[PDB]
Design a protein around this ligand. Structure first.
Ligand SMILES: [Zn+2]
Ligand SMILES: [Zn+2]
Lengths: 770, 250, 770
C-alpha cells in the first residue's frame, strides 16, 4: 500500500491545492489512497486494501512517525533494502516485489532513506548507483567470468527513465516544448487522460516548475541555511508554479547555491535527499514534509507518463549521455560487467545531424575507453569521426571494457491518406535515411566496423516486414552486416503475429546468425493470450487474407488439421473475391503466387545499388506463367478500390483456430527459425499476471511451460522493460535467476545454466566486428 | 472459502495480507486443531501452535505459560452468551455458563475468556493488526483444511447455497464446478456437500433463477464438453438439493 | 616396512646410545622394527611383518647394500619416484601409499636419493620442490586453465611441517623455549609420552643439538673436506648432544663453512644430502651412515611430534615466511597454480604485534607480486601498512599471481574455574582482539579490501558457536565481510556435532555465500562413526539437554520418528528439572524458548558498535510473555548450581538414535545449509581406514556413498592434512582425483568434473574483494 502514497494523481492534486498550514490530512490521504488503488490495482477485494492501510497507520503510530514521505520511505527501505557484502542489496525473495514497485516509484529516495537510517559499515564510501540488485555468489561469479551481453536497448533513447526526470528539470522548456508538440496528437491526449485526466500542457509546466522550486527550497534546508524570509509568504503549493515569489512588493527567486557543479545530477539529488532525511531523522516540519511529498508525487507521475509513452532526445546528441551510458554498462569494478553492447539509435534525415549523432556516440565511447586504458591515442583531442576512428583502431578486444556495436533504427509510420502505393512516403523517408547512412559508410569505410546492423523497430501494424526488404538488401551491399526487425510484439490476432514472423523470415534477407526481435507471437500460448480479450477481434481485410493464406500454407501437410487448412483456403478465396473485386475464379495457389511477391520493390518495374532490386521484377515479368499473379499484385498495390478494401475491417472469432492449431503454427515458425539459425532477443515485458507466466521460460524449456512439439530457438537477452524505472541488464539477469530458483524450484546451478545459455546466445549472435 | 482453490485465490493479492490479531490467533488455533492428525502437515501444526501461544502472550498480556490446549479450551467458549454468568426462553443460555463454572478444572479458560471479553487491553490488542504471508500455508495444507471442513459439512448434512458471483476471469473458474465434481476442477480429497441454487448475482441487472440455471447449463455444455443430458443431470442435482433442504412446512 | 627404519623411537634410542664402532646391528634393527610396527600399525598379523622384513633384507643383500639409511632411501625412491615429462613424479597407483608414507617420513631425503641414483635428463636443472605430485594431463590442463583455490590453511601456522624442522635447527633455543613452555601442560605431557615415553625437554634439547652436529659433520663429508681430527674422539652419539667436542684437552666446535648463505634452507639441505649420497653411492662408513640414520630418525620424530600438536610462531612475523608461502602457492611457472588464497592468522592482543603481523603479511605479498610484475610502485621500499596498501592498490586482478584474502582467527579456550558467566574471560580476550582489529580497520579503511572474514577455529568443545555471535555481528558492522566458524570437527556424539552445526546456522550471522568449516558431523555416516567406540559415551549435561531439544525440534514433523521426538522431549524436560533445580513444570516449548536466547550477549541487559547488541535483549524483556524463558536463561548463565550441573557428566548410549534417525538429522541440517547457501570447506583428514571412506565422496554424490535423502551443500577445497608433512592444495587435488579414478572407477573426465566442482566452489564462495 506504500506505493499509492508516492504515486497517486488524487493525492498529488489534493496536496498541491490545499494550503501548507492545513494540518490533519490523514482522512484525505486515506481516501485518495483508496481511489488510487481502485484506479491502478482494481482487483484488490475492497477490504484487503482497508486492512493494509490500517496496518500501515499502525506501524507509523507505533514507531512514532507521522504519515508522510519520510515514514513511507523508511518503511519501504527497511522492507526491501539491506547491507550485504558490498553496498545495499535487495532480498532475493523480495526482488520480484521490488521490480513491481520500481514500475511505480523511483529508487533514489528509498536508497537515500536506507543510507540515512540503516547505513552499512563506515568504511565503504557509498556512491549512489542504480539500480539495486540482489546478491548471489553464483550469479556474481558468472558475471565476473563471462560478463553480460546487451542485444536490445531502444526504449527511452537508451537511458533509464529516472535520469530523464533530472533532464526535464534541467531543460524544463525543452520538455514543455516536446509535451506541447505531441499533445496535439490524439494518441497522446488519450494517454494523458488515462494517466492524469486534467493534465494539460499548462499544469505540466506548473508541475515541473513546482518540482524545481521545491528542490531548491529543500536543498536550503538540507544544507541548513537560514530558511530565507520569503518562506513565510509561501502558503499554497501553487505559489511554486512560478519562477519567483512575491513576499511584500518584491519578487524573490527560488534559486540557491549548490555544492556540486552539476546541480541536476543524480549524485546531487542523492546528496540533497540524504541531507534532508538526516536533518528530518527524528521529525520534520509539516509544510516542508508536504513539499517533499509533492516533489516525489510529481516525479513519479512524470516518470509514469514518460515510460508509458524528439527534441529532448536531440539534447542527448552530445558525448555525455553516451559516456554515462558506457560508464553505467561498465560496473564499479576495473573489468566491465557488460562485454558486448549493442547501441541502437534513430537515423537522422539530415546528413549533418547523422554525422553529429555518430560523432557524439563514438567520442563518448572513446572517452569511456580512455578512462580505463592508457595508450598512445594519436589525436589526444579528436574533433572528427575520422580522428575518433583513428583513436579506436588501436583498441584491442582484450575484454576489459565494453565493445560497442551501433545499430540504426528504422521507424515505421502508418500509411497516409493519399499516396501512390501503401507506405510510399514511409518507404521514401527510409530511403533517404538509408542513403545518408550509405554515404557515411562510403566517405568513411572504417565505420563498417562500428555500424553493424540495421534494425527496424516501432509499431508492427504500421508497416509490414515486406516493405523493408529492398532497403535491407541495398544496405547489405552498402556494407551493413546483420539485420534486425521487430516482429510479434503487437498483433490483432495471434495467427496474425505468427504470420508476421513467418513473413519476416521468408521475405527479409536474414542470414545465418541474424536476430529478429521480441517474437512474442510464437512464445505466448493460446491459453494465456485470450484472458481478457473479446470473443471477436476485428482486423483489416489484408491481414485477414494473409492470415488465411498462411494457415493454409502451414496446415496443408498436417493430417490432423486438414479441415482447418481447407476452410482457410475457402475463406481466403472468398475474401480475395471482394478485396480484388474479381469476377473470374482465383485459386488459393494463385493467391499464394500473388502474395509471394510482396518482397518486390513497388516501383521496380510494376509501378547504383538500387538497380538490382529495380530489375528484380524483370525475372518475374519474364516468366510467361506469372501473368495473373502479376496483374493481381499490381491491383493490390495501386487499385484504389483494393486499397479501400484492404483498409476495411472484418471480425474474426477468438477461437477461429483451436489451441492445438495455433500451437502447430507456432511450432512450424519455430522450426523455420531453428533451421535458418535466427535468434530471438527476448526482453522482459500485458496478459501476464506474474513473471512466471512469461514465454521466455517456455522457450528455455522449463517443465510445465514447454509444449510437446516445441523447437529451441536461440534466445538472447535484452535490457528493455517497458514499464519500469532504472532497469539494467544485470537487473533482468537477476530477475530471471530469482524466478527460476524460487518459482520453478531450480537449484542455483541449474538456474544459472539456463540464464547463461540465453546470455551466451547474445555473444554468439553478436553483431560486433570479429 | 472451502470452494475457491488456493491457486485461484491469490492472483492479484499482495504477498502479505494484514488481519486482526484475534482472527490471526483463531486461525492459528484452527490450523493446529485440523493438522494435528495429518502426518504430512505436522510441521505446520506445530508452527501454528507455537505462533498461537506467542500471539496469545501479548493479546492477553499474560506473564505465566498458556498452552495450546488451554487456548483451545478458552476459544471453545465463544458460543456462550457474554452476559450469562461471566459478565423466559433466555434463561437456558443465561445459565449455560453455570456448567462451565461448575467444572473445577475450567478455571484458567474461564478467566482468560473473561479477559478476552472485557479487558480493555485485550480488546485493543484484538483490534490490532498483524501481517501474514500469502504462502503462510502451502496450497496442499490449505486444501487439507478445506477438505476437513468439507468432511464436517457432509457428516452434519449441511447444505451450501451457492449463487453465481472477483478473482474469476471466466465463469468456468467458479468453485461450483469443483463442488459438482467436474474433471479438472475437483481435487483428489474433496467431499460432496449438497450444493443448492440461489438467484443472487451481485453485479447484474435483471437476473433470475432460470437465468442462472441456463448459465450453468451453458457453461457445462460448452466449456466442459458435457452433453446436454449430463449437464442437465449435474445442474438438476443442485436444483433438487434446494427442494431437499427447503425450509417450507411439510 | 621401510617406514619403520626411518621413523622409530626404539631404533633411535638404540642407535643413539650404542657406540659408533659396535658394528653388526642387524638383529637389533630388526627387533626395534617389530616393536615400532606393533606400536604404530598394530593390526599387522605378526607374520606379514616377519615376511616383509625378510624380503627387505633379501633385496638389500641381493643388491649388495648394507642395512642403512642409504639402502632404505634407495628402495623407497625406486618404488615411488620416477622421471616423467618434467622433474620427478609419483605413480598414480602409488600416490595413496606415498601420502600414507609422508605421514611418517620426510620427502627430502627420498628426493635426494632419487636425484642421485636415478636422475632425469641432464637438461632440466632440477631445483628441489616439495611436495612430489603425480602426473595426469587432464589434471594439469585443468590447473593451468582454472588454477586452484585455497579456503582452509590454518594448521602449522600456514607452512608445511618440514620447514619447521629447519626452523628449529635455526632457532634451537626458541624451539626449546616453546617445548618447555607447554611441557608444563598436561595435554602435552600426555602427547609426548604417547609418542616417545622418555622424551623430556632435556632429551629434546640433546636431540636437536645432535641433529645440528650430525648435519655439520655430514656436510663436511658431502663437500669432502679432510675429516677433521676430532672425529676420532667422537665415539658415542651422545657426545654430539653438546656444542663442542673434547679431543685431548681442547674443545673443538662442530661448525664448518657452508656454500649457501642460508645454511638452514631446504635448498642447502637438499644440496648437502645429494652430495653425501653421491659420495656414498657405492658404500659408506658405518659410523657416518649411522649418524645419517640418527639424523633422519630425529627429524622424523620431531615432525611427528609437531604435526600431532607461540614463540617459534612469532618468529614467522617477518616478510619471509609469507613471501615463501606465496612463492610456493605460485608454481614454478609464470602463471600461478593457486588463484584465490585465503591466509588465516591468529589475531594478537597487542595492537603493536597486530600491526606488526599484518605489515609482514602485506609486505611479503607485495614482494611476491613485484617478483612477477613490473609497474610503477610509488614507494619502491614500503615501510608502513599505508605505503604497502598504496603499492597494492595498483595491482589488477589479471590472474597471473595469487590473490590474497586475510582471515583472522579466534581461538576458543575452555572456560575457567571462576567467572561471572561461562567463557566470560574468553569472550573478553576475543573482545580485545576484535577491538584491535576494528581500530586497525578504522585507521586504515583500505584494509577492508584485504581482511575479508573472521574465522573462529580451535577446539569445538571449548566454546559453543553462540558465544561468537555478538562478536561477529559487531565485526560485520566494523566492515568485516564473510564469516567462518569451525563446526562438526570433534564432538562427544554425532547428534552433538549435528546440533552444533545447526546452532551455528541459526545463531551466527552467516549470510549468503558464507562458509562454515569441516562440518564432519553431517558428512560422516552413523555406520562409519561407531567402529571402535564404547557402547556408552559420556557428555556434559548441557550438551545432552541441547541435543535432546534439537532432536525434538528436528523430528517433531517426521511421521516415522515421532517416537524418538517424544522420548527426546520427555528426557529433555527431566534433565532440565535437575539442571535448573526447578520445582515447577517446564515444557519442551519453554525449554526451546530458553535455548533460542543463547545468541544474546550475556552482559547486555540480563547480567559504539556494541550498543546494538547491548540493547538486543531489551526487545526480549519487552515481550510480556517472555518471563520464564528469561529468568531460566539467567539461571542458566549465572546460577552456580546450574553451572555445576552443566559441567556434570551423563552417559548416552551409542545407539540412542537409530542410524535412520541420525541420517534424518544430518539431512535436515543439509537442507538448512543448502537453503541458506552456506558452503563447507572440507580438507582431507580417525575412523577412516582408507581414504575412500571419507565423507567428501558422500557430499560429492558418488554412488554407494551418497544416502537417499542427501542434499548438495557446496563443498570447497582446503589444504589442511593434520598428519602429513609437506602437503599442498595440488597434492590434495591429485589425491582426490586418484581416489576417484582408481577406487570409484570414474573416468579421468568424470573425476576431473567432480573435483573441479569443489575447486570452483572455492572461487564462488571466496572472500576476496570483487
Ligand atoms: Zn523492442
Ligand atoms: Zn580446520
Amino acid at each position: 500500500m506504500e506505493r499509492f502514497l508516492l504515486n497517486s494523481t488524487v493525492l498529488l492534486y489534493r496536496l498541491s491545492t490545499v494550503s501548507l498550514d492545513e494540518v490533519s490530512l490523514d482522512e484525505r490521504v486515506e481516501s485518495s489512497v483508496f481511489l488510487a488503488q481502485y484506479e491502478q490495482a482494481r482487483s484488490l477485494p475492497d477490504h484487503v486494501a482497508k486492512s493494509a492501510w490500517s496496518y500501515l497507520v499502525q506501524q507509523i503510530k507505533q514507531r512514532n512517525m507521522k504519515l508522510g514521505p519520510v515514514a513511507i520511505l523508511r518503511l519501504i527501505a527497511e522492507k526491501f533494502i539491506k547491507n550485504e557484502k558490498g553496498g545495499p542489496k535487495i532480498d532475493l525473495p523480495m526482488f520480484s516485489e521490488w521490480q513491481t514497485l520500481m514500475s511505480r516509484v523511483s529508487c533514489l529516495p528509498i536508497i537515500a532513506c536506507h543510507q540515512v537510517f540503516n547505513p552499512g559499515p563506515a568504511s565503504q564510501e557509498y556512491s549512489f548507483r542504480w539500480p539495486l540488485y540482489p546478491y548471489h555468489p553464483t550469479v556474481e561469479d558468472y558475471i565476473t567470468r563471462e560478463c553480460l551481453h546487451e542485444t536490445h536497448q531502444h526504449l527511452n533513447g537508451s537511458t533509464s527513465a529516472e535520469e530523464c526526470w533530472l533532464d526535464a528539470l534541467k531543460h524544463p522548456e525543452a520538455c514543455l516544448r516536446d509535451f506541447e508538440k505531441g499533445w496535439a496528437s490524439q494518441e497522446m491526449k488519450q494517454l494523458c487522460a488515462q494517466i492524469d485526466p486534467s493534465l494539460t500542457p499548462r499544469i505540466f509546466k506548473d508541475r515541473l516548475q513546482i518540482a524545481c522550486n521545491i528542490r531548491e527550497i529543500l536543498c536550503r534546508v538540507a544544507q541548513g541555511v537560514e530558511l530565507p524570509e520569503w518562506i513565510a509568504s509561501m502558503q499554497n503549493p501553487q505559489q511554486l508554479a512560478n519562477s519567483t515569489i512575491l513576499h511584500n512588493g518584491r519578487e524573490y527567486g527560488f534559486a540557491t547555491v549548490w555544492p556540486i557543479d552539476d546541480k541536476y545530477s543524480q549524485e546531487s539529488e542523492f546528496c540533497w535527499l540524504t541531507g534532508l532525511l538526516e536533518k528530518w531523522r527524528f521529525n520534520a516540519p509539516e509544510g516542508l514534509e508536504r513539499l517533499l511529498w509533492i516533489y516525489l508525487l510529481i516525479q513519479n507521475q512524470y516518470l509514469t507518463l514518460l515510460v508509458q509513452r524528439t527534441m529532448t532526445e536531440l539534447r542527448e546528441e552530445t558525448e555525455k549521455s553516451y559516456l554515462s551510458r558506457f560508464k553505467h554498462a561498465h560496473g564499479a569494478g576495473v573489468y566491465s560487467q557488460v562485454r558486448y553492447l549493442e547501441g541502437r539509435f534513430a537515423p537522422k534525415s539530415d546528413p549533418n545531424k547523422m554525422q553529429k549523432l555518430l560523432f557524439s556516440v563514438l567520442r563518448g565511447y572513446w572517452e569511456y575507453l580512455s578512462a580505463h586504458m592508457s595508450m598512445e591515442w594519436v589525436h589526444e583531442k579528436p574533433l572528427t569521426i575520422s580522428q575518433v576512428l583513428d583513436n579506436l583502431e588501436l583498441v584491442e578486444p582484450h575484454g576489459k571494457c565494453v565493445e560497442l556495436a551501433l545499430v540504426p533504427h528504422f521507424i515505421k509510420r502508418k500509411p497516409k491518406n493519399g499516396e501512390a502505393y501503401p507506405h510510399a512516403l514511409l518507404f521514401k523517408d527510409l530511403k533517404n535515411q538509408a542513403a545518408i547512412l550509405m554515404d557515411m559508410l562510403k566517405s568513411e569505410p572504417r565505420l563498417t566496423g562500428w555500424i553493424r546492423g540495421v534494425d527496424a523497430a516501432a509499431n508492427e501494424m504500421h508497416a509490414p516486414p515486406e516493405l523493408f526488404c529492398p532497403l535491407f538488401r541495398v544496405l547489405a551491399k552498402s556494407g551493413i552486416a546483420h539485420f534486425t526487425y521487430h516482429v510479434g510484439e503487437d498483433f490483432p490476432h495471434l495467427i496474425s503475429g505468427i504470420r508476421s514472423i513467418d513473413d519476416a523470415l521468408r521475405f527479409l534477407p536474414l542470414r545465418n546468425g541474424d536476430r529478429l526481435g521480441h517474437c512474442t507471437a510464437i512464445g505466448i500460448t493460446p491459453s494465456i493470450w485470450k484472458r481478457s480479450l473479446p470473443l471477436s477481434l476485428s482486423m483489416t481485410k489484408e491481414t485477414r487474407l494473409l492470415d488465411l493464406v498462411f494457415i493454409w500454407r502451414e496446415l496443408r501437410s498436417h493430417p490432423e488439421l486438414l479441415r482447418y487448412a481447407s476452410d482457410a483456403a475457402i475463406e481466403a478465396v472468398r475474401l480475395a473475391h471482394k478485396v480484388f473485386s474479381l469476377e473470374e475464379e482465383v485459386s488459393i495457389t494463385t493467391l499464394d503466387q500473388v502474395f509471394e511477391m510482396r518482397g518486390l520493390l513497388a516501383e521496380s518495374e510494376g509501378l547504383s545499388l538500387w538497380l538490382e532490386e529495380y530489375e528484380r521484377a524483370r525475372e518475374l515479368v519474364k516468366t510467361t506463367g506469372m501473368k495473373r499473379p502479376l496483374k493481381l499484385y499490381k491491383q493490390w498495390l495501386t487499385s484504389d478500390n483494393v486499397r479501400k478494401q484492404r483498409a476495411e475491417y472484418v471480425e474474426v472469432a477468438l477461437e477461429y483456430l483451436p489451441d492445438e492449431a495455433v500451437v502447430a503454427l507456432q511450432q512450424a515458425v519455430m522450426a523455420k527459425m531453428a533451421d535458418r539459425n535466427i535468434a530471438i532477443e527476448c526482453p522482459p515485458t500485458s496478459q501476464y499476471r506474474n513473471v512466471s507466466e512469461h514465454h521466455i521460460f517456455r522457450w528455455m524449456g522449463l517443465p510445465g511451460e514447454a509444449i510437446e512439439g516445441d523447437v529451441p530457438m536461440s534466445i538472447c537477452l535484452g535490457s528493455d522493460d517497458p514499464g519500469i524505472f532504472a532497469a539494467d541488464l544485470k537487473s533482468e539477469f537477476y530477475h530471471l535467476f530469482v524466478v527460476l530458483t524460487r518459482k520453478f524450484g531450480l537449484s542455483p546451478a541449474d538456474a544459472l545454466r539456463k540464464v547463461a545459455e540465453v546470455n551466451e546466445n547474445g555473444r554468439i549472435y553478436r553483431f560486433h566486428d570479429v
